[PDB]
Amino acid sequence: DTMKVINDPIHGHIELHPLLVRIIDTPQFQRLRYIKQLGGGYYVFPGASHNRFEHSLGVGYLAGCLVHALGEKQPELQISERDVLCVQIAGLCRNLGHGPFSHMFDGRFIPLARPEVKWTHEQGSVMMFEHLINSNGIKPVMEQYGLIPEEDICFIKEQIVGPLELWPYKGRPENKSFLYEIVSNKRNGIDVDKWDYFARDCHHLGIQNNFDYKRFIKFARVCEVDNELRICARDKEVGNLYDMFHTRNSLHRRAYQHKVGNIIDTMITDAFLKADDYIEITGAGGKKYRISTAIDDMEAYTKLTDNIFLEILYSTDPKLKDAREILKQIEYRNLFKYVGETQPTGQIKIKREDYESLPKEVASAKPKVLLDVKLKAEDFIVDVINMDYGMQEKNPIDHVSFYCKTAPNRAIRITKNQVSQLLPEKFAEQLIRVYCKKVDRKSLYAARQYFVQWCADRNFTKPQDGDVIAPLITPQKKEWN
Amino acid sequence: DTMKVINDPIHGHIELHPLLVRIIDTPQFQRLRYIKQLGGGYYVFPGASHNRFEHSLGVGYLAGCLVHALGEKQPELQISERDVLCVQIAGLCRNLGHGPFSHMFDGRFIPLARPEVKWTHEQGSVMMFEHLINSNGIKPVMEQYGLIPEEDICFIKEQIVGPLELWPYKGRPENKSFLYEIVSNKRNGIDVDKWDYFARDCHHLGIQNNFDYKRFIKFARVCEVDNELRICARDKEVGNLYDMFHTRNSLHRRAYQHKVGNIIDTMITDAFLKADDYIEITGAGGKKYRISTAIDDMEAYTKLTDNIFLEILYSTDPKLKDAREILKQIEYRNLFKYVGETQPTGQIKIKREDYESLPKEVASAKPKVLLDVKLKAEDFIVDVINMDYGMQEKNPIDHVSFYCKTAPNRAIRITKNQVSQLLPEKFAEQLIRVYCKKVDRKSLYAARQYFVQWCADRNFTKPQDGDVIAPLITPQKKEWN
Amino acid sequence: DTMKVINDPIHGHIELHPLLVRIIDTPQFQRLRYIKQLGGGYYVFPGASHNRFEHSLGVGYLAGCLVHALGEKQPELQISERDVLCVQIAGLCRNLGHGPFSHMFDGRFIPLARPEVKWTHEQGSVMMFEHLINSNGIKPVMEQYGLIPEEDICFIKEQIVGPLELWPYKGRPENKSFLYEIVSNKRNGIDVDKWDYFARDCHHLGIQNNFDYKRFIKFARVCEVDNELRICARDKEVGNLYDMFHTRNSLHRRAYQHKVGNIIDTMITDAFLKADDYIEITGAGGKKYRISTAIDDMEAYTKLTDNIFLEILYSTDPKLKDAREILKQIEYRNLFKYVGETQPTGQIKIKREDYESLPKEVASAKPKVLLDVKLKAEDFIVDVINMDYGMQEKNPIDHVSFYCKTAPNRAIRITKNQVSQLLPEKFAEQLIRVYCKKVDRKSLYAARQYFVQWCADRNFTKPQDGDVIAPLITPQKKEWN
Amino acid sequence: DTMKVINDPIHGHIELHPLLVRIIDTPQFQRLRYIKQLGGGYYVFPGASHNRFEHSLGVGYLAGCLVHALGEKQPELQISERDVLCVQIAGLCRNLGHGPFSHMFDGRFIPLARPEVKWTHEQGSVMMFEHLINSNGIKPVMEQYGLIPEEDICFIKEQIVGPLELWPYKGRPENKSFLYEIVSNKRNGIDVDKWDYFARDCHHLGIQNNFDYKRFIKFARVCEVDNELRICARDKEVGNLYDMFHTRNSLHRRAYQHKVGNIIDTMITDAFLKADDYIEITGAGGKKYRISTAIDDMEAYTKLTDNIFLEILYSTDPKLKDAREILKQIEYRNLFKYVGETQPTGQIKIKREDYESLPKEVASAKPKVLLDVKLKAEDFIVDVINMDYGMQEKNPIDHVSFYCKTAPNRAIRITKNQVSQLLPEKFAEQLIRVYCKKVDRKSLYAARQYFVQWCADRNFTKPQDGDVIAPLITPQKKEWN
Numbered sequence A, B, C, D: 001d002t003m004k005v006i007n008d009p010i011h012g013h014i015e016l017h018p019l020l021v022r023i024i025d026t027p028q029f030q031r032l033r034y035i036k037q038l039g040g041g042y043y044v045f046p047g048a049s050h051n052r053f054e055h056s057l058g059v060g061y062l063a064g065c066l067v068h069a070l071g072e073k074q075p076e077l078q079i080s081e082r083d084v085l086c087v088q089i090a091g092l093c094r095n096l097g098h099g100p101f102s103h104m105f106d107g108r109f110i111p112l113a114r115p116e117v118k119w120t121h122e123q124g125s126v127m128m129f130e131h132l133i134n135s136n137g138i139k140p141v142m143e144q145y146g147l148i149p150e151e152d153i154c155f156i157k158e159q160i161v162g163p164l165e166l167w168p169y170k171g172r173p174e175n176k177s178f179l180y181e182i183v184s185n186k187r188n189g190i191d192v193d194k195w196d197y198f199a200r201d202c203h204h205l206g207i208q209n210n211f212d213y214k215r216f217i218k219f220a221r222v223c224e225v226d227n228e229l230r231i232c233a234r235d236k237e238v239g240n241l242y243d244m245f246h247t248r249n250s251l252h253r254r255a256y257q258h259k260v261g262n263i264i265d266t267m268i269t270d271a272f273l274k275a276d277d278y279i280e281i282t283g284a285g286g287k288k289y290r291i292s293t294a295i296d297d298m299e300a301y302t303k304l305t306d307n308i309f310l311e312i313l314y315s316t317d318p319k320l321k322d323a324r325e326i327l328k329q330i331e332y333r334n335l336f337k338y339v340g341e342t343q344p345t346g347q348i349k350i351k352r353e354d355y356e357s358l359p360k361e362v363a364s365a366k367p368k369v370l371l372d373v374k375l376k377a378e379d380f381i382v383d384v385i386n387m388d389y390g391m392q393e394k395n396p397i398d399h400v401s402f403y404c405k406t407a408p409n410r411a412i413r414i415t416k417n418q419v420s421q422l423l424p425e426k427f428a429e430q431l432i433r434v435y436c437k438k439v440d441r442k443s444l445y446a447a448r449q450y451f452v453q454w455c456a457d458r459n460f461t462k463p464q465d466g467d468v469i470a471p472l473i474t475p476q477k478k479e480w481n
Ligand SMILES: Cc1nc(N)c2ncn([C@H]3C[C@H](O)[C@@H](COP(=O)(O)OP(=O)(O)OP(=O)(O)O)O3)c2n1
Pocket: A005, A006, A007, A008, C044, C045, C046, C206, C207, C254, C255, C258, C260, D212, D215, D240, D405
């Protein structure tokens, strides 16, 4: 039990403390080797074969880099070795809750399979961390290295998920407030998890990263802001922080929300829903779970990975035939068809709780055109995509604190108009894409008429080639024509 | 006289046609080995040692890549080998007119030394191309490779400078209109010269490039727009084109307009102005020129490179003592001190003719604070920087045309609101930086009070560090809190 | 059916002809998404998540690049569009026969499971290509794009596996001999499959590539050598060819034969052998196969991927308990322990048929050291690795032909002594690694003594750490000090 | 006077201690901005525009990285902050003594201009460091940061040049012996100066680096070897150390000893020799120096940079006409022509004192062929190149010490045969290149016959193109033919 060195292509040679090695070398952590970072994105970007495992190593490494740098520049913060280890463990473990195909699972699958439950990957990360610690005897090893599990497990979970129910945290007191801004920053979103995925996703996607996290670390300092110690950036780095959120948005546009990647995620989700009654995942006491109920037992969840796709694709049971046929269509590239895209107008925003009603609304639109085929609710997919700077409608840079070179302990704010008139005026928008599971030319022509009528009925923006693919619908709506 | 292969770190192994080799292997072209691409930027970014020569090779290479690709995908454009060569020569030669320290020369030095003249590096490029061709017997070699010098020299110069005095070009007829969009695109600025410097500057600066020119080329086509053939992009690339101008702006912000890089260029310009009466450059017929008049004689201009800096630094002539002293202060890093940065508010746009009044205004501000030292107008430098998307106040993407995959011969426009609500609302702005020649702590404290008061008096934006550098001045202005 | 552009992180935007797209979009080709290029190497190098799929796209792309370049520089070769497509298809499909964990399957598993059979991934590639063509109606699409399936299928298979039964090939006549040197070069090993994996493996492993394939392509020409047309290199590039084989050897040393990577492949192979009696894969006509017999039916083999590992790891069947326990030990990092490495001295070359006797020899060595524990044959693993320049004992550069600048169609030979005295004198060697399945410190201390004694008894090389791991054994051997 | 951050493209954001900033911001250090790292190599590799300045920053940074890492892992070494600073300063300053065009100056120019003197860039670095310290008041700033100038200046100079006159060093006692292995390692050549130029030269040249210095640092430890503390490497990294010297050799072959790069350096050297009587460099007290005597006066040497080339190229003095004509021919690419290359056979080695006699030997060969032109001694250039692993005929890995994982304080040796049979059998060789100053086809044909005959007469290796350039000469020699 000494240090291991691991060679990562993004970060080079990284050192792992032996307690971190003990955490990594568990079924709960090694599971992340079998979950793709970008899910169905790999079916569009063939370099994007990378998994949550290596990303987790990277996050843990960067968490260590930031906390060490702060402690070397500011010994008055009294950052301890124990603090450093706890921060590295939180960084390492904050992806433990991801399910098959990452965001597909918590973003698409669980909301449709278990609409009553409130599941997030962050909650999953805490539950899975706890399962990891308790199933592998990690607490006595934490003690052996000078951690106090009672306080430190709490601190680690709070770094992942936020306050577990006034300084609201219990794992550390207010004089270590800044430690909660490293792994998952709920104040403004500037955290080490982003820094890893920007570099790693870019390396794999074939799109080049333009944010420099190392520079950010060299300029970061802790200062008192409204009687709390916070991580501040140097004033003249404000431009680079606007660019960082721009880079995130650009990665969503180019890659994460690619229209074919999203439809592949939708098709996989559909196959899972059709397979859900038949796939068995064994959990504690030999109880059997399904894909949708594995989240209720961490022993079952440990065994729920991207493997489910192949278990379905390779099955021979006739009960799995419909699920298997969807995955086969993905292989033949016979995809659900893109019908069109629109945006709401203004601050107008469709909420998650209305998502399920949308296919029905589209199917109930009454286009005044002669239609051969009639389509049903279940023939449409309606994908609602939120493109924002991580804080809904808010500018995250308004929630960053800065210091200037002449008074490095004094925190200040910088407004948008102090920076540049070329920056966005809004920080959120929503795209709505519609697709049809019926792929013949008749169906697809009809689907477009339903779609364009629905856009008119909802006062959404005119679809870009609306005059060509629905010439009899677009003239009713005079802001469009 | 066959093909040469050259290994460039940005583009890899590049082929040069023997006619291009004949052009390169002249004193007029080789001169570009002694002119830094980024001028005083090298004194801030020590990787930025690269010169105009290797940039020119790159531009020539990319010009060839684009024109070849268009001709392979669209043989109906009738792009000839002669067209290809002429476009490669224009690309290669469009940096010939740059002077010592690149933009310092035409952006700062000549405007102050010869305020009566209208000099641009593009005009210089034409004059120097002509001098290159005539001094080295290139016309018979052009004939040998199928070029018609009368027409082709005209075409090449027109690609560099625009129309030399209703289709306005004489080098090629309207059916080859698209060939004028490759090397220097006056309609929207999307040209191969940017593509080279984005990649090359980034490689040397230590900032990573996020634009993919190869992707753009795969998706580019020529289409008829308002009865003219133009280079158009696929519809789905619109987002990437907004990102490309965002990348340009970001490189200006981080590197090209770095506040210390700019002050170094200012100090070098000041040394050149003080040297200008005394340095001699010999030109045609043994006539003597100065730094400021070498632009009038291409034989003299051929010998005007970054060497002037060292000729001044190493001089012993007592007449050069003042100029030499400024350069010596640069070496000791005794630089004019940065005081702050502000922007005008609104459509307000400060013209060149008002630049001279600005140091006076700063010095006349009456901050209501006890000051030991008093500063004079001559102690302040006020640097006004125009930041835009290359078409003054206009959105260049409104001047690009796009096609969709199922109707590739129909070009259309895409508006800003069809793409995203998160895009810029303005496309031009001004930054104003102030510096003080007096460098002691007393002077610099006073300078900051004058500066912040001046910003308040002019209704300019609050400086980012204003509450720290001028705590008594920032509360008077209620627009600021 | 138009061309698709795909973004690959190694090669950028690559074009896939519609025939290639039809081949790719099949269950037989998409299978390669679920087979890791480097097998158990991912368990050592966490960047090495890449699969055979994206490697195959790269090899197809590079095959296209070489054949196009040869035809552009030398139109007299009469390379047709049909030739180009056949070479691209061979490049794309030459990885089709790989099994779970790539080299683990054909290098370790099948030799132990079916010692009587002679299976290679190349034979598998041919069989799988045939199954792909016949199950997906590809022959009519080949006809549509100008191929003649009878001859071209033969040519493609010959490019993958060599002559299918005096010019020995039937797919193309001798005047196109050079086309068989692109995808899998049996004459000297210089082929585009290597060029892709050097770049792609390095990008993912975090080890940097030093070979420049683009340079090689610019310098490659076809010349007549001993009455046959061959791909020749420029004379002065001979040093870069020696470096290419040096790079391959270095990648084997650092990554592909990593001692822990190899032990993980050994442990996975051991789990597969224990699982082989119980896992069933359904093939053509509903016949049932095992992991070891799936190679006999392409319908079954289509469903044999890295998924097998997870099928075993997640099983609950008591019959799979022993197999599952081995995989669980991998997850806990309870790995067989590395004891040491040695080499034979001289021409001595251990053959496959003697591999089984080696653990017995190690266990029978009589070290003169006090040992508590006694180890048996079954406690040792002995891994024999052949390290060479791809042509067993031969120098591959002796099988390359070169041209000089003054006579570019005239082939010559270059001997090793004309190039450098710093080059290898031998081109093949064996490494022998020993490991212990008993993992406690007593057992491992004993294992090292048996190991070092065995090396002394066999006149093998002194282990690098021999004086530290066996201080009382190394002095007996005077060859060693 | 706090820390500065500098963005370097190779190492990223680097911190410079304020004492280092004071050293850098002097005319003696800033001079290195005007000296190309690779001299005439820029005239072949157009990316190789980088200067000694940025390389120096890199060496200083890496020296700091190594010494810090050793001190963090091994606090028992008692490495002090003072030690760290002294090592960083030596790393920063060990390139101060380079002259115009780097190796051209001390490798070609000074040996010919001042054959009586024994000048090395390392001696120049010491002299220039002394001049820097004394002219800029650095000693009291050293005191201010805890250095003891008397001892520490000595230590710094000893790190650059070796012992300044039984432990032979005075700057530090034997218990800090390992500190002398960081900046310039005279025992085996493994030092941080190589590590910087490998990465930086590669970045600029367009050749990719395959050595990982960060890995080496993670594995380096200090251990007692023959009663002295030395930097040792981990046993299993021995292969990477062989690769490191292979990489150095490969960079020499591809770039540093490029045949055209070398002829350009020869031509520049010749121009400097012809200019040397006439160019004046002013030094201390207004005394005048020449190019060849500026090495005797650090004030003059401060002003001796690559600018000399342009001072000659731009001159009008008739006395400089001959020098100026040579440089003009370089611009027109009218270069002396490459005739061929050969090697001696065996340990046979041509020494420096015989270099001048070689053109006479070539010219006295009697080729048995009809020749039109006859050539004389002064028509030939003979360039002798020594290619080795840095220790003449010796294997530098024999002078490295290693530790193993089970006994990390115990140093051991590893022999070549313990590592691999594929390694070099020799570690030094010589290349001889011949060139002709007469460039017409007749002269060059004759030159090749003299050359190839001379090779046959001296039993040198057959030129690679010998059968093509001299078909009537190569059959006489049966080893060749
Ligand atoms: C850049 C590059 N070069 C290598 N030569 C090289 N060898 C292994 N690696 C990678 C693989 C891993 O990600 C990491 C550590 O591998 P390493 O072989 O050092 O550790 P291992 O645990 O096998 O050895 P010991 O227990 O004996 O110390 O470094 C390498 N990376």
